[PDB]
């Protein structure tokens, strides 16, 4: 029941962010929430081309790196690449079919587009520091440690996408599909979208930043300068992305948008909390693999763990959730220089 | 079912463009078809911002235009805006769930992104030539003369999207849904994709170009020059988009990418021919409405009609279809100054 151009003349200022009438005319002279137009405008102002960044000295740097530091650097990079691959396509596939206001539809497409640029920047780095990129790319798919840390991301998107197709195809109600009873609840689909967004928020605001810290640890040593420039550019974009998800989530929570979404956010709040706690643990467990061959001065399991708790508390407070970790000062204040 | 990250390590160089394993890793160091990587790079190199184009004198030009000329200009503008609205979201929603090679997936997202910029440029023009943009935007949705192709265009996309969902959810076979038999055939889905791409090819290659002729007719008289500068940039982008669809179609019909599609294409060749001619006829009929109050310098029903046949012959030959019209030289050579 999805349509690429709804024929009903509707007031786009009165539609909910999600599950309303599919967006027909793409107009940018007005909006229900100007924050999304501001984000589009900002993201477009930050346009950059990865291949332009000089990474010619990164190969020399990387090669001269101690084997365990090469492991740390490359493992971190492979994970970042995995996340960008997923983020380049997922916002579009999972959210586009559910958006009902123009400013948000375009923001998602612009956000997704910027992620593909991030993916392109990683190919630029990889092909300029290793002999055969295929070994790195193939390992991204097979490496159990990497998939372990990312476990739950693709699965959630996939479930939302499948439920969305059922909704568009069958509509609300209880159906019989190949002799099986299939329930299609809009309320349940809204919950799935809401939690998916919370998961994306944790991905954008936590997972990416933990990886930035690892990348910048080398920048502090005056090594991998090209990669550092790229990470700074990526981080600038990620800041906009997480601002977008925090606003989507807090607007839904306020009750100023879909009233039902406000109820759902409230009733499903323990689930929001649980997903952050789980994401944090996954980022922490990754330390065992990252530092399996040894750690670096100023970068080890303890420091990584401390940073995960530090940033997780900050991000959770931003969306109104209780803090799971003990409060503490930034364990790596040097990262500010790069953000 | 569809997945945002296929867990199977596959050779992306051997996958078909569509219907193969969903793309997992987004890499750009290699391609099965380098044309898509080349298009991504070219499109990125062409990035432009609408707001940076001076359209300050277009308002006075518009107000000074004879009433029928305002009709010609604004009617054409509304149709272009309609097409961009559809093109900004549709390639992503319709193609992303079916692509199996990375270069094509990212090209589609880049292509779609560029279309959203075009939509933004139309808001920029509209808000600078009319007092209340809402009048223009609302008419785009309900305008009977405009909302005719939109229906046909959106139909091909909507049908492909719906059948794609059934395929991902139920797979091939004869199913039952609420007492009704539902047949899912990959062959029919492949045909729907081919028809959809052919329709998009006609949209990018003919529909947009016919509209450019009208916009530049004003440019030739040194009027609506802000609009003209924006259309020049848009046309530069559409050239890339049509190149992309032409390669997709030719690769699918040749049999080099998927024998089944090649078999299907030959089977529905007459249908695609009629589909193309129908699009040309619709563009032609638009003249009765466009020049109902009168015509202008270098632009009239007959000239437009000639240009439609001229461009259609070229585009159809480019994708292996017979020529439906009498051959002849460009009826409006002056258009080359802008294209
Ligand atoms: Hg998600
Ligand atoms: Hg999500
Ligand atoms: Hg780290
Ligand atoms: Hg929740
Ligand atoms: Hg919550
Ligand atoms: Hg800790
Ligand atoms: Hg299509
Ligand atoms: Hg189509
Ligand atoms: Hg025209
Ligand atoms: Hg024309
Ligand atoms: Hg056909
Ligand atoms: Hg054909
Ligand atoms: Hg004609
Ligand atoms: Hg003609
Ligand atoms: Mn990113
Ligand atoms: Mn992001
Ligand atoms: Mn366009
Ligand atoms: Mn186009």
Curated annotation (Swiss-Prot), chains A, B:
It catalyses: a 2'-deoxyribonucleoside 5'-diphosphate + [thioredoxin]-disulfide + H2O = a ribonucleoside 5'-diphosphate + [thioredoxin]-dithiol. Signal peptide: none annotated. The active site is at residue 122. This is Ribonucleoside-diphosphate reductase 1 subunit beta. The keyword Iron applies. Its cofactor is Fe cation. It holds the Pfam family Ribonuc_red_sm. GO terms for cellular component: cytoplasm; cytosol; ribonucleoside-diphosphate reductase complex. It comes from Escherichia coli (strain K12). E.coli produces two separate class I enzymes. This one is the functional enzyme during growth. A substrate-binding catalytic site, located on R1, is formed only in the presence of the second subunit R2. Fe cation 1 binds at residues 84, 115, 118. Tetramer of two alpha (R1) and two beta (R2) subunits. The B1 protein is a dimer of alpha subunits. A radical transfer pathway occurs between Tyr-122 of R2 and R1. Fe cation 2 binds at residues 115, 204, 238, 241. Coiled coil: none annotated. One of its GO terms (molecular function) is ribonucleoside-diphosphate reductase activity, thioredoxin disulfide as acceptor. Provides the precursors necessary for DNA synthesis. Catalyzes the biosynthesis of deoxyribonucleotides from the corresponding ribonucleotides. R2 contains the tyrosyl radical required for catalysis. Binds 2 iron ions per subunit. InterPro entries: Ferritin-like_SF, RNR-like, RNR_small, RNR_small_AS, RNR_small_fam.
């Amino acid at each position: 029941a999805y349509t690429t151009f709804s024929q009903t003349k509707n007031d786009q200022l009165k539609e909910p962010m999600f599950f309303g009438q599919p967006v027909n005319v793409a107009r940018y002279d007005q909006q229900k929430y100007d924050i999304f137009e501001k984000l589009i405008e900002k993201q477009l102002s930050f346009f950059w081309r990865p291949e332009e960044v000089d990474v010619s000295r990164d190969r020399i740097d990387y090669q001269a790196l101690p084997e365990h530091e090469k492991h740390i650097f490359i493992s971190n990079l492979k994970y970042q690449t995995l996340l960008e691959s997923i983020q380049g396509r997922s916002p579009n596939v999972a959210l586009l079919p559910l958006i009902s206001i123009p400013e948000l539809e375009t923001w998602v497409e612009t956000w997704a587009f910027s992620e593909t640029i991030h993916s392109r920047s990683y190919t630029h780095i990889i092909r300029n520091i290793v002999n055969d990129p295929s070994v790195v790319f193939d390992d991204i798919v097979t490496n159990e440690q990497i998939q372990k840390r990312a476990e739950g991301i693709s699965s959630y998107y996939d479930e939302l996408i499948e439920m969305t197709s059922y909704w568009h195809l069958l509509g609300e109600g209880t159906h019989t599909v190949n002799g099986k009873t299939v329930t299609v609840s809009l309320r349940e689909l809204k919950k799935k979208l809401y939690l998916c967004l919370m998961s994306v928020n944790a991905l954008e605001a936590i997972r990416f930043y933990v990886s930035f810290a690892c990348s910048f640890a080398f920048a502090e040593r005056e090594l991998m300068e090209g990669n550092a420039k790229i990470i700074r550019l990526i981080a600038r974009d990620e800041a906009l992305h997480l601002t977008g998800t925090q606003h989507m989530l807090n607007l839904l929570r306020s009750g100023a948008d879909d009233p039902e979404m406000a109820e759902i956010a409230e009733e499903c709040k323990q689930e929001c909390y649980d997903l952050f706690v789980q994401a944090a643990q996954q980022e922490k467990d990754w330390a065992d693999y990252l530092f399996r061959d040894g750690s670096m001065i100023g970068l080890n399991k303890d420091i990584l763990c401390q940073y995960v708790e530090y940033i997780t508390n900050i991000r959770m407070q931003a969306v109104g959730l209780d803090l799971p970790f003990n409060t503490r000062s930034n364990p790596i204040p040097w990262i500010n220089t790069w953000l």
